[PDB]
Model the fold of this input.
Amino acid sequence: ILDKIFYGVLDQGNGWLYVYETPNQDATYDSALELVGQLNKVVDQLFEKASVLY
Amino acid sequence: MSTDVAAAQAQSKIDLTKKKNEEINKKSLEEDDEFEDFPIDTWANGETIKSNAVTQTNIWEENWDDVEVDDDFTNELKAELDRYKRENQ
Amino acid sequence: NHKLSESDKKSKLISLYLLNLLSQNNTTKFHSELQYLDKHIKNLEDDSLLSYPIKLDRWLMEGSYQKAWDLLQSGSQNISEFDSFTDILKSAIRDEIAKNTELSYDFLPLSNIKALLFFNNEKETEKFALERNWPIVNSKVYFNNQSKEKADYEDEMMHEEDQKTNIIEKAMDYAISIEN
Amino acid sequence: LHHSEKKYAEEDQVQELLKVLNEISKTTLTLDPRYIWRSLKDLSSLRNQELLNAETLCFTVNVLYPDSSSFKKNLLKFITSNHKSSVPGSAELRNSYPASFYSVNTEKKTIEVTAEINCFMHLLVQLFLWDSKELEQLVEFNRKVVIPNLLCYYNLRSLNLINAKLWFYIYLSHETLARSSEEINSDNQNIILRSTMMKFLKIASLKHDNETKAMLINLILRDFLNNGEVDSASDFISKLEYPHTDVSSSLEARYFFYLSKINAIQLDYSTANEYIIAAIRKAPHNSKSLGFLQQSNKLHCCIQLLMGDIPELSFFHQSNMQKSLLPYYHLTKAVKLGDLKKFTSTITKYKQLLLKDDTYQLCVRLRSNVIKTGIRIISLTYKKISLRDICLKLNLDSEQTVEYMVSRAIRDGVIEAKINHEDGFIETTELLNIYDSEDPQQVFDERIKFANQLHDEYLVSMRYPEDKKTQQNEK
Amino acid sequence: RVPNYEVSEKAFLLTQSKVSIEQRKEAAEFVLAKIKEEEMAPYYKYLCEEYLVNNGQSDLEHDEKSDSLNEWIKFDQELYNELCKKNESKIKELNEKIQKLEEDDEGELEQAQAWINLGEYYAQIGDKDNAEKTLGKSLSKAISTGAKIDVMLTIARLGFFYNDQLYVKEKLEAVNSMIEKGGDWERRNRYKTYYGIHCLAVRNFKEAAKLLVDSLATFTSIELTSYESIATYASVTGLFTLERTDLKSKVIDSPELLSLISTTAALQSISSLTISLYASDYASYFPYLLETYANVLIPCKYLNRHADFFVREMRRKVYAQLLESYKTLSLKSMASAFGVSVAFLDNDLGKFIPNKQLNCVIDRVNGIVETNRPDNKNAQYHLLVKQGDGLLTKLQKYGAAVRLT
Done:
């Protein structure tokens, strides 16, 4: 389970194993994290340019 | 002297002749500089600023310590104490 | 101040005035008055009966109602004209905890209801329950009915299109701003 | 000798004054005269402090004054009189000008453009008092003369923006004079001051001059904050429409700072939080602005603990303010652990410092908040937790007592739990899966509108100076 | 040069007095032998400055505290005299040789190199100020870019030697600038090792990991503390930064760690722990945690700042991985797995849960531990908004600032 080679979770509150086989981590939502990631770099560089006006 | 990271607020506004006197006016309005009055008031150099390693002077990235307990003492006792309960059962 | 503006009667009179405001159940006003008393007497004629209205405010904001009920109980040994705000404040507390218990519970026995509302008589508990509109049937309350009413009242007031907030309306808003 | 220094300084004043004088003659302008005036503001302070004290006297005598010279001279005679440089060539000429207020023109009385010059004379004397750092009577003299001079004529648009800065210095000396010492004479004079403030504001409303009004609004709010008539201030903030136009970035900083104090007393901790972070971002970083920033940072920390938000530990260490914020640093830790015992000790130990800043009033309110914050930790750490165990941790007395505390705290809905009375434990209802609810929609909706409003602010600002370059000659 | 790093390490045991009694005794005698022989007398005086009423003090050439558990650092007045003798005599003779070379022609090669030799003698004996100036002369004179790198590194070593991090920080920035300009790989390897240990002394071990894995593959030993300690540093950062799978492949992508085997106490204690995390042993894990505190963190110059920081963080990891893999556990069993009692176990957990880097709750009535960590669309949503809030803030201040001007 630690590998996530079959996902699922080990329930020892009762002594079962839940077997999930379902996708984890959506591709589209992920790349939106990188998109914000780039822009946070970009606004710093605009602010480097804006140091001329100050 | 700036609040948090200094360079982030140093770029936000630099020296201008228009605002310079206006900077004083706001400070004077609040009444004091409030970083030089506290030492006079307490009547000795603090030891509550030396309360942690970072509080006096931080040249590190914040640990999130503010309680600073050695955890090796209590864990050593936890291991052995549990062992005895089992042995004397 | 320092020429008949500070007075013995002034200290006594501020103690009562503060109690009048607190019984209105606006703490908003209380703190604003309280700020003014700092510059005046609060350390100059010290606190020993000007202490009492502040202590009471603290025990209700945290919501320790044992400490609060205690302080009012000991504020009935203040028989002169102070006993006249105390009764209002014992009444107010019953209502306060009765709002609280909506969130906390859905089930209480009668015995558990009696303690929390600070009643000593069983008939008094059932008396409040009718007027506060608690459906206690078979000696058990169903607060989830009571939450529905209060939630339903918040919707009923006409604001109601944008309070619910329409799926359709968000997209329209986004669109027009771009096409402004 | 002495006269040489006065003459160098005199010429400085005159060029900045002459420039503006031309500008307002074409049609009254606001921001273009303001830029010049703001630089002159700084200059007058650095020359007056470092270089003589009758250096103000020379200019005031030389120009044709309406009574202002008489008013200046009284002050100086008392501290050892100077009458030098009141002799011809220093009391005969009105300072070279082309025709704007030229010596020949003015003496002949084809012109008497004393107007702006009179405003500038008021600014010099008021500044010179604050630079000297003397209070009591000197202040009272400054207040009596200048207030009715300006009100026996309806100021033109251009003159009006100057007198907002005069209203500031009068008020500041008066306020600190009352905070010097309690006096039966200081006390009666504050009613006098209060009346004038609001009357000034009404004039500022009539001309819709934006910076005059905004600066006057600040002074009224400050005075309310000091007298403890927040009740009277709640009404006042509800009838604002604060201009964001012609203001200085110093005016805007002070404004947002004042809302946060009132807000905190009205148990608005939510809007208070945005408003103080806002105030700091307009506000410059400088050691010149330091006492302003300190009070803002103390105000901010306390606001968070009253939310239950709990300031970062980081905030205290990385600032160069650790000593000033030293009590706030210990308050943040006190609430964190849930410790009544620490907390009671911290606010008593630091009582007086807290009392100077007028934040002693806010701190006592955190006594409730230690209890509420304690319970939010407890519901995270344990899903199901007996009533007794909680009593151990927070030093409480009964099971029944802690039940009241949680009952009230979840009426505010911070803990997000529900109490089992019948079973003896408190069970949290937190499980999220709020990405199956419509909640993200609302949150996304708000962010977009903020982005759109930032476009609008890009639009008004960007194209406005473009127009000006077509208008001016540079071909 | 090479002798400096051994002396400091042993000296750090005298700085501490929370270390083992026999260990500190041993370390004092070594330092004393090399005070006589290699002139380490200026740095012996530097140790008392680092006290003034603090434990580990006993000095008699300066302030004494035999209340201290160290009483083997005591000075002699033979020592005070040996200092002054060698100090003066050596500077005078070595300098005179240099003066002659300056008289003679060729300064491109001969004179710059001669100046390097002064800075190595002061580097050795722990004079930082005097080393800097004379190696300041070598850099002034045009030479190879590789030599300039070598010299800056000799200077950078001296900041760890006194254990002043600010001095290193400054100096390694000049190395980064000149490392590309030379484009030498010889000293590219050294630079990562130096800079690795600077990252180790501060709280960012993620960078430290990335530099020190390169240092395993190729190690450059001169002027840099020995290769068994470099293994111990890679292993420290490994435990903190990675998780099971990544950790396993890292120490199999380093054959050298396994083939070096434990050959020192610090290496043994860290390596025992490395295995147990990734093999998902919890049983013997909890004791090994105590061993690492004792024999790595406090003895090390750079991890003595991390003695409380490490132990606190490392416990989160071991719990984290087990809880992620389980929907529910029982508390008693979870306590047994580690080897603690039930009540004891909560306390550690209960600091980690509200910081919300463990994403769980604990029933104390069922006795079950619930795991309610989103790992779906909800988690990605929860992370994203924080960044997007950040973007809003960046624009709010910068927007205002340009519009007003």
Summary: Residues 1-144 of chain C form one domain.
